[PDB]
Structure formats: C-alpha cells, structure tokens
Amino acid sequence: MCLKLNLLDHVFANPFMNAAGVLCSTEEDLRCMTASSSGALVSKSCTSAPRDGNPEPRYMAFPLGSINSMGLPNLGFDFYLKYASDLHDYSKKPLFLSISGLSVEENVAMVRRLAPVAQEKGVLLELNLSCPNVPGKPQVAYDFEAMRTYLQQVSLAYGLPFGVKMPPYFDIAHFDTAAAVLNEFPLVKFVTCVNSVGNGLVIDAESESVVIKPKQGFGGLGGKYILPTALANVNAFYRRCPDKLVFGCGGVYSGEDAFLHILAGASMVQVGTALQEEGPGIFTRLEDELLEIMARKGYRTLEEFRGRVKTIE
Amino acid sequence: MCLKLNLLDHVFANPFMNAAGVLCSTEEDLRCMTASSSGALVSKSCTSAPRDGNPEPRYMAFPLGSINSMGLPNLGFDFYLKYASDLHDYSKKPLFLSISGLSVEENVAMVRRLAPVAQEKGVLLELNLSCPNVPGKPQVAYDFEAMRTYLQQVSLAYGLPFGVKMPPYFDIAHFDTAAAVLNEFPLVKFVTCVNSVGNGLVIDAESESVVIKPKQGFGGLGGKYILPTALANVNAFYRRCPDKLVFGCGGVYSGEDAFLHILAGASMVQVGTALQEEGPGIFTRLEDELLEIMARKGYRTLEEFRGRVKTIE
Ligand SMILES: Cc1cc2nc3c(=O)[nH]c(=O)nc-3n(C[C@H](O)[C@H](O)[C@H](O)COP(=O)(O)O)c2cc1C
Ligand SMILES: Cc1cc2nc3c(=O)[nH]c(=O)nc-3n(C[C@H](O)[C@H](O)[C@H](O)COP(=O)(O)O)c2cc1C
Ligand SMILES: O=C(O)c1[nH]c(=O)[nH]c(=O)c1Cl
Ligand SMILES: O=C(O)c1[nH]c(=O)[nH]c(=O)c1Cl
C-alpha cells in the first residue's frame, strides 16, 4: 500500500503539503515544513518587495475553522527566490513557490527572474489569482478578462509549466467560464482549488465585536466551514480540465477529508487551517489515517480511486 | 420584556420566521408555520405553473448543515396567491410570498396578479434572485445587468414595496456593485441575505458517492457551514443600504446565532436548515434564548443593538 505519486516530472512520497501561507513565510518555517513528513511544501505568496501585512489581530481560529486578513505579509521575492536557488534541499521533497503580485506587471517581473531557477532546480510556480484580503484589490480570478490577461502575460514571460491558485466559485456558469479560461493555456498544468472563502465575518457574542482588525472584520474563511465548497470546486475543475492536474485545498483535518478530496479528483492535498492549528505533526497523522481508509477498502494506490466519486443514477 | 417590532407597516411579535422553502410548500405546511410561535412566515418560492422539482434524494442534512438541490418544486403561483388572498389568517402574523420565476417575463406576470392581493391583504413580496439549483438557470443576482432588468421590470409591474432574496457574495467589489444596483430601486424596502451557498458538494466516504441525485451531487449549502458568510453579507448590505431593511438568513440554530445576525444589522431573522431539522418548536426555543442573552446584557429592545457590531480600532 502506497501514497507515492509522480507528477509534473517530480516524485512525491505522499500527496500532503501545506497550503500557501501556512508555516512557510520564514527560512525557519520552510526548514520546518521540509523536516516534516509532508510530500511537498509551498512558500508564502510573495510580492516583489517585502510586506508587513495588515494590522493584528489578523488571524483567528475556532472549532469550525479560521478567518484571516493577513494582508500578504512576506519577506519579498528576493528571499523566496534565494531559498529556492540556494537553500532548499530538493533531496528531501519538491518545492513550490507562490507568487502573488498586486498587478500583472509585478507578476511578470517576478516570473522572469524565477524562470532560470525553475529550469536549474525544478522549483514549481503556483500563481496566486485569488487573494481576498488586500483592500481595493478584488480577486483577480473573479474578473475573467483580468484572469486571461494575467495568464497570457505570465505564460509569455515564464514559458514553463506552472499552476494557479483559484478562489472558490458558487455558480455552474462560473465553473464553466473559469475552466474554459484555464484550458486556453497549455502551460497551466495544475489548478489548486481552493483559496479561502472570501470576506466572511466572525462576530464574538460576548464582546459584540468582530475578531480581526483589518477590513472591519471581514476576512477569508478556512477549515470545516469550507469542505463541501472545496470538494465542489475540486470536482468541477477535475471534470472540466481533463488535461490538467487539480490540487485540493480546503477543510482537510483528517485522512477521511483527504480521501474525499482525492475521490473528487485531487492529486496533491494541501492543509491550511488544520496545519496552522495542529502543527506539522499533522502530516504523519493524515498519512496513517488515509492509509487506514485505503486498507479497509482494498485500495493499494491513489490512482485506484482518484476522481472516482460516484454520482446517483 | 417582549420581542415585538414594527416593520414595513406591519407588526411582528418577534423577529423570527422560516426561511423560504422550509416548512412552507403546502397548505398544511403554511397552517403549521402560522400555528407556530414565529413572528412571520414566507411561502415556498413559486413559479407560474406547478413544478415537481428535481429527482430524489434532493435534500440531505448533517451535523454541520444541509445540501439541497430541490429544483423549485412548488404548487404553483395560483395556489400561493389563493393562500394569501383567502386562507391566511393575518390576525396571527404577517405573510411574505416568495416568487421565483425562471425569466423576467414570468416574474412580471406573477407580480401583476399579486399586486391587488398585496393592496387588499398586505401580503409582502420577497423576490427570489438567487436560486442555485435549476439546471441552466444561474443565480440572477450574480449577473448584475440581469438583476437590474429584473428589478426595473418588477418595480414597474408591481408598483408596491417589496424585498429581494440575495445570494451570498464573497468579494468587496461585488458587495459595492450589488448594493448600488439595489439602491437604484426605492420600492426595494428589504434585502434578505442569504440564500444557500451555491453549488457545494457533499461526498460520503463509505459509499464513495455524492449524497444528492441532481446535478451530479452539486447543491446549495445551509446551516453551520454558512454562518460567517451570512453575517458578512447581512452586515455588508446593512452598511451599504442605509434606507432599506436587511433580513438575516443563514446558520441560525440558537438565540445566540440570532443575536449575532441582529448585531450585524438584521431586522428579521429567518431559520432554514435548523427548522427543517428540529421542527417548528424551534421558534419558542430561539425566542427564549434571545431573550435570555438580552437580559444578561441589559438590552431591553432589539433596536438598542441592531447593527451595533463593534470593529477593532
Ligand atoms: C494564515 C493564512 C494565510 C494564507 N496565506 C495564503 C497565501 O499566502 N497564499 C495563498 O494562496 N493562500 C493563502 N491562504 C489560503 C490557504 O492557502 C487555503 O487556500 C485556505 O486557508 C483554505 O484551506 P484550509 O481550509 O485548509 O484552511 C492562507 C490562509 C491562512 C489561514
Ligand atoms: C430544502 C430547502 C429549500 C429551500 N427553498 C428555497 C426557496 O424556495 N426559496 C428561497 O429563497 N430559498 C430557499 N432555500 C434557502 C433558504 O431559504 C435559506 O436561504 C438557506 O437555507 C440558508 O439558511 P439556513 O442556513 O438557515 O438553512 C431553501 C433551503 C432549503 C434547505
Ligand atoms: O492575506 C493573505 O496573506 C492571504 N490570505 C488568504 O486567505 N489567501 C491569500 O491568498 C492570501 Cl495572499
Ligand atoms: O432548489 C430550491 O428549490 C431552492 N433551494 C435553495 O437553496 N434556494 C432556492 O432559492 C431554491 Cl428555489
């Protein structure tokens, strides 16, 4: 029985990795994720220049999940590029680098510099088209013309296989249109579904207050709140992008939740809120728990059940 | 201390009502909702002609909420209009009638016949712009040009105060645009936030199967999954539509959940999934619970705290 995968010309011990943004902003965080049992890791979404992000409190967690408006705090592209070029031990596991420029121009400037490092070292680009937490900057992937422009310009400037981090959609016509946009771009080899469910609002009854300071308390939701939304978008894109990989993200706390993602079509399975709350020991637990489910069902590999969710009638 | 309030030139005993679609399809249902301790009721969204709806199983509930793809099954507008005109006891509580035509023309046809009964009896119109479950008919209010056309045509045909059932939005630009569209129409006097979070997907691990039959398992989500999204929308619209009422719907299971909706800005509070699961006895419990929270905090009235959610700095 086996959790190994081979995709995008890399080998993975298992499908689990962090979700972008969680346990991946500093050199310390990246070494920690590397030292963990995860199959891979992804760096914090970066901008050309360092950012402090939004004021605190900007993340909070609860039984059912998390709310965040971090504001894209990061050490800047130069640092994550250096990590990829000089510091990361690729003998341990594959590295993804998340880029989240605030304009098409900033993304193109970054990917131009990334390309030689991707060629040399095999770092993989995840292009973030879904941040929901920087004031005055709606999600790029909710404007399909903007999305197309970003992908055209990035494809042209980068010229190498990459993937995209997508927001959740909630309308079949939006699935149809977004997947069709993506399918215009052959270099988009993977689609990560989903970013946080945007602009929710958690309120504390005792204090009568919102629980995060930025944006009058509005922030992206993760965790148990979003699992069926996540599974829906995984499956929607799995069905609509038969020539691409889909990576699942949203609501993973157990091997069973990972199993659902995989049934829905996920290749890699990313872990955000639960990893933030539990720490990197979660990866051994998720591995054991997925293996257990597979043993009980007689499944020997992930491809025996990936995308094999049954519909009724 | 009593929870009674006045809104829309009607008196209500308390702010509680069913969510449209739940316990409101048949004469029996509507008599039961009338007999309950809810402050008001709303009928099942109706079409000009009767509809059987989508195939079964089409609703399923779980500890964290529900998924449904009912497909607008209803007895037909003639039945709901006759209920409003001839059967409902207005001495017990106000009645809202929900219309959900599948085209602008269908909605106009219904509201032209509703108008005289609204003038005579005081039944209130809730225009449903957010059904996520009829194949090929995406949510009207996710197309702002379409939403504008519907609201121009209904306002012209109806000529009387009405309200609108909105989908959840997840992007600040969408809140800004949607509220500005609503604010173009002075006859829109209430905004109900939210309909189900569209097109989620629940999968059962043991069977490896989706749990509802229509649309390959995709359906709208209600219940605990959606409370922070519902609160966000209620507050977003409460902030942006200062001359309209906001009715809250989504994730209400307790008096505390109702207290948060009201803090976010809700005037009425609708109960879907929890009502479907618990039955109409839920209304006495919610009232007892909300009163108890009010007492412990020293609130005498709902107005003292409606919309008075605190932000940080
Ligand atoms: C603290 C925090 C930071 C995040 N930062 C990023 C990020 O930099 N880039 C990104 O694509 N998504 C980011 N996300 C979104 C997560 O990658 C993930 O898509 C989302 O939390 C849903 O997964 P979950 O339910 O496991 O939390 C962040 C989430 C959290 C909670
Ligand atoms: C079985 C079912 C039927 C529904 N039918 C309607 C409907 O006819 N019209 C409508 O506007 N909303 C309908 N909804 C949405 C609910 O009114 C409500 O907006 C949603 O369920 C979220 O509230 P909740 O979290 O309390 O369930 C329906 C929901 C369910 C569960
Ligand atoms: O605020 C963040 O930093 C953040 N938070 C999110 O939930 N998703 C994102 O893509 C980002 Cl970039
Ligand atoms: O499928 C339904 O009938 C239904 N279900 C919902 O969750 N919202 C609606 O507006 C409708 Cl009309």
Going by C-alpha positions, the residue among B288, B275, B302, B208 that lies closest to residue B66 is B275
**Cβ proximity of B52 and B116 under 8 Å:** no
Residue B248 φ/ψ region, left for φ over 0, alpha for ψ in the -120 to 50 degree band, beta for the rest: beta
Residues B62 and B28 in one domain: no
Residue bearing the CA closest to ligand 2, atom 12 = B20
**Cβ proximity of A279 and A273 under 8 Å:** no
Which position has the token pair 């902030």? B239
Q: Which of B55, B135, B142 lies at the smallest CB-CB distance from A171? A: B142
Please tell me what DSSP assigns to residue A33. Answer: H
Helices (DSSP H) in B131-266: which residue ranges? 144-158, 172-183, 227-240, 255-264
Question: How many domains is chain B partitioned into structurally?
Answer: 2
Q: Which of B138, B213, B313 lies at the smallest CB-CB distance from A171? A: B138
Cα–Cα distance, A107 to A100 (Å, whole number):
7
Going by C-alpha positions, the residue among B241, B260, B255, B171 that lies closest to residue A210 is B260
Three-class DSSP category at A226 = helix
Going by C-alpha positions, the residue among B289, B301, B266 that lies closest to residue B1 is B301
Residues B206 and B301 in one domain: no
Instruction: Please give the single-letter amino acid code of residue B83.
Output: Y
Please tell me what DSSP assigns to residue B205. Answer: T
Cα–Cα distance, A46 to A98 (Å, whole number):
6
Contacts with B306 from chain A: Cβ below 8 Å: none
Q: State the resolution, in angstroms.
A: 1.7
> Given B131, B193, B241, B249, which residue is catalytic?
B131
- Whether B260 and A139 lie within 8 Å, measured CB to CB: no
- Spell out the residues 6+ positions from residue A252 whose beta carbon is closer than 8 angstroms to its own: A227, A258, A261, A269, A270, A271, A272, A274, A286
**Residues 131-170 in A contacting B (C-alpha not used; CB under 8 Å):** 132, 135, 138-139, 142, 167-170
Instruction: Please give the single-letter amino acid code of residue A181.
Output: V
Sheet holding A65-68, edge to edge: A59-62, A65-68, A218-222, A197-201
Going by C-alpha positions, the residue among A97, A89, A120 that lies closest to residue A42 is A97
- Whether A218 and B64 lie within 8 Å, measured CB to CB: no
What sign results for the dihedral spanned by CA atoms A81, A87, A91, A93? negative
B232–A contact, CB cutoff 8 A? yes
Cα–Cα distance, A3 to A275 (Å, whole number):
19
Q: Which of A201, A212, A311 lies at the smallest CB-CB distance from B232? A: A201
B212-251 exposure pattern, b = at least 16 Cβ within 10 A, e = fewer: bbbbbbbbbbbbbbbbbbbbbbbbbbbebbeebbbbbbbb
Reported as type and span, the H/E element at residue B65 is strand B65-68
Residues A207 and A104 in one domain: no
Domain boundary among the residues A183, A207, A222 is at A222
Q: Is the peptide bond before A194 cis (omega within 30 degrees of 0)?
A: yes
Cα–Cα distance, B266 to B249 (Å, whole number):
9
Q: Which of A138, A172, A228 lies at the smallest CB-CB distance from B138? A: A172
Q: Which atom of ligand 4 is nearest to the CA of B131?
A: 10
- Spell out the residues 6+ positions from residue B91 whose beta carbon is closer than 8 angstroms to its own: none
The strand pairing partners of B36, in sequence order, are: none
Mutational test site, ligand 1, from A196, A197, A226, max ligand atoms within 8 Å of CB = A196
Angle formed by the axes of helices A227-240 and A172-183, nearest 10°: 50
Residue bearing the CA closest to ligand 2, atom 6 = B21
Residues A113 and A165 in one domain: yes
B57–A contact, CB cutoff 8 A? yes
Cα–Cα distance, B294 to B286 (Å, whole number):
12
Please tell me what DSSP assigns to residue B217. Answer: G
Structural domain of A211? 54-71+197-222
**Cβ proximity of B272 and B249 under 8 Å:** yes
How many other C-beta atoms can be found within 10 angstroms of the C-beta atom of residue A298?
Answer: 8
Cα–Cα distance, B66 to B277 (Å, whole number):
9
Please give, rounded to a whole number of angstroms, the shortest distance from the CA of B291 to a CA of chain A.
Answer: 14
Reported as type and span, the H/E element at residue B193 is strand B188-193
A90-104 exposure pattern, b = at least 16 Cβ within 10 A, e = fewer: eebbbbbbbbbbbeb
Cα–Cα distance, B143 to A173 (Å, whole number):
11
- Whether B225 and A228 lie within 8 Å, measured CB to CB: yes
Helices (DSSP H) in chain A: which residue ranges? 27-35, 77-82, 104-121, 144-158, 172-183, 227-240, 255-264, 273-278, 282-297
Residues B138 and B216 in one domain: no
Query: What's the CATH number where B63 sits?
Result: 2.30.26.10
Cα–Cα distance, A281 to A39 (Å, whole number):
13
Reported as type and span, the H/E element at residue B104 is helix B104-121
Which position has the token pair 């094999």? A308
Cα–Cα distance, A83 to A88 (Å, whole number):
6
Q: Which residues line ligand 2 (CB under 6 A)?
A: B 19-22, 44-45, 59, 66, 68, 70, 98, 128, 165, 194-196, 222-223, 226, 249-252, 271-274, 276
Residues A41 and A167 in one domain: yes
Q: Which of A133, A177, A199, A227 to mutate to test the interface with B (most CBs of B within 10 A)?
A: A199
Q: Which atom of ligand 3 is nearest to the CA of A73?
A: 3
- Whether A228 and B228 lie within 8 Å, measured CB to CB: no
Q: Which atom of ligand 3 is nearest to the CA of A44?
A: 12
- Spell out the residues 6+ positions from residue B147 whose beta carbon is closer than 8 angstroms to its own: B129, B140, B141, B178, B181
The strand pairing partners of A311, in sequence order, are: none
Residues B291 and B205 in one domain: no
Going by C-alpha positions, the residue among B13, B174, A46 that lies closest to residue B4 is B13
- Spell out the residues 6+ positions from residue A52 whose beta carbon is closer than 8 angstroms to its own: A71, A73
Instruction: Please give the single-letter amino acid code of residue A35.
Output: A
**Number of alpha helices (DSSP H) and beta strands (DSSP E) in chain A:** 9, 16
Cα–Cα distance, B270 to B293 (Å, whole number):
18
Going by C-alpha positions, the residue among A250, A258, A308, A245 that lies closest to residue A287 is A258
Cα–Cα distance, B187 to B165 (Å, whole number):
14
Cα–Cα distance, B262 to B252 (Å, whole number):
11
Please tell me what DSSP assigns to residue B122. Answer: -
Give the method of determination.
X-ray
Q: Please compute Rg for chain B using Cα positions.
A: 18
Mutational test site, ligand 2, from B165, B196, B197, max ligand atoms within 8 Å of CB = B196
**Residue A135 burial class via C-beta count within 10 angstroms: exposed 0-12, middle 13-18, buried 19 and up:** exposed
**Do strands A95-99 and A124-128 pair parallel, antiparallel, or not at all (unpaired)?**
parallel
Query: What's the CATH number where B161 sits?
Result: 3.20.20.70
- Spell out the residues 6+ positions from residue B130 whose beta carbon is closer than 8 angstroms to its own: B139, B140, B141, B165, B166, B167, B194, B195
Please tell me what DSSP assigns to residue A132. Answer: -
Compute the half-sphere exposure of residue A29: CA atoms within 13 Å on the CB side of its CA.
18
Reported as type and span, the H/E element at residue B109 is helix B104-121
Going by C-alpha positions, the residue among A135, A274, A262 that lies closest to residue A198 is A135
Going by C-alpha positions, the residue among B164, B154, B162, B224 that lies closest to residue B195 is B164
Instruction: Please give the single-letter amino acid code of residue A257.
Output: D
Residues A165 and A118 in one domain: yes
Six-digit token string for A223 = 């965790």
Compute the half-sphere exposure of residue A17: CA atoms within 13 Å on the CB side of its CA.
29
Which position has the token pair 């800047």? A76
DSSP per-residue string spanning A46-60: B-SS-B--SPSS-EE
Residues A148 and A58 in one domain: no
Instruction: Please give the single-letter amino acid code of residue A242.
Output: P
**Residue B66's Cα: distance from chain center in Å?**
16
Q: Cα-Cα-Cα-Cα dihedral of A9, A15, A16, A17, to 10°?
A: 20
**A199 annotated ligand binder:** no
> Given A2, A32, A46, A131, which residue is catalytic?
A131
Residues A189 and A218 in one domain: no
**Residue A31's Cα: distance from chain center in Å?**
19
Residues B302 and B187 in one domain: yes
Reported as type and span, the H/E element at residue B119 is helix B104-121
Cα–Cα distance, A291 to B53 (Å, whole number):
41
Which position has the token pair 């069902």? A297
| ∠ CA A176-B205-A261, rounded to 5° | 40
| ∠ CA A140-A143-A144, rounded to 5° | 110
Please tell me what DSSP assigns to residue B85. Answer: I
**Cβ proximity of A80 and A43 under 8 Å:** yes
How many other C-beta atoms can be found within 10 angstroms of the C-beta atom of residue A237?
Answer: 27
Cα–Cα distance, A71 to A56 (Å, whole number):
10
Please tell me what DSSP assigns to residue B300. Answer: -
Contacts with A69 from chain B: Cβ below 8 Å: none
**A18 annotated ligand binder:** no
What sign results for the dihedral spanned by CA atoms A215, A217, A223, A228? negative
Angle formed by the axes of helices B172-183 and B144-158, nearest 10°: 20
What sign results for the dihedral spanned by CA atoms A220, A223, A224, A228? positive
**Is B32 part of the annotated catalytic residue set?**
no
Q: Please compute Rg for chain A using Cα positions.
A: 18
The strand pairing partners of A7, in sequence order, are: A10
| φ and ψ at residue B101, rounded to 5 degrees | -60, 155
Q: Cα-Cα-Cα-Cα dihedral of B132, B221, A273, A64, to 10°?
A: 150
**Do strands B95-99 and B124-128 pair parallel, antiparallel, or not at all (unpaired)?**
parallel
Compute the half-sphere exposure of residue A187: CA atoms within 13 Å on the CB side of its CA.
17
- A38 touches ligand 3 (CB under 6 Å): no
- Whether B64 and A67 lie within 8 Å, measured CB to CB: no
Mutational test site, ligand 2, from B17, B18, B22, B225, max ligand atoms within 8 Å of CB = B22
Distance from the alpha carbon of residue A258 to the mean position of ligand 4, in angstroms: 29
**Cβ proximity of B108 and B152 under 8 Å:** no
Residues A42 and A83 in one domain: yes
Please tell me what DSSP assigns to residue A252. Answer: -
- A68 touches ligand 3 (CB under 6 Å): yes
B256–A contact, CB cutoff 8 A? yes
Six-digit token string for B26 = 């048949």
Please tell me what DSSP assigns to residue A3. Answer: -
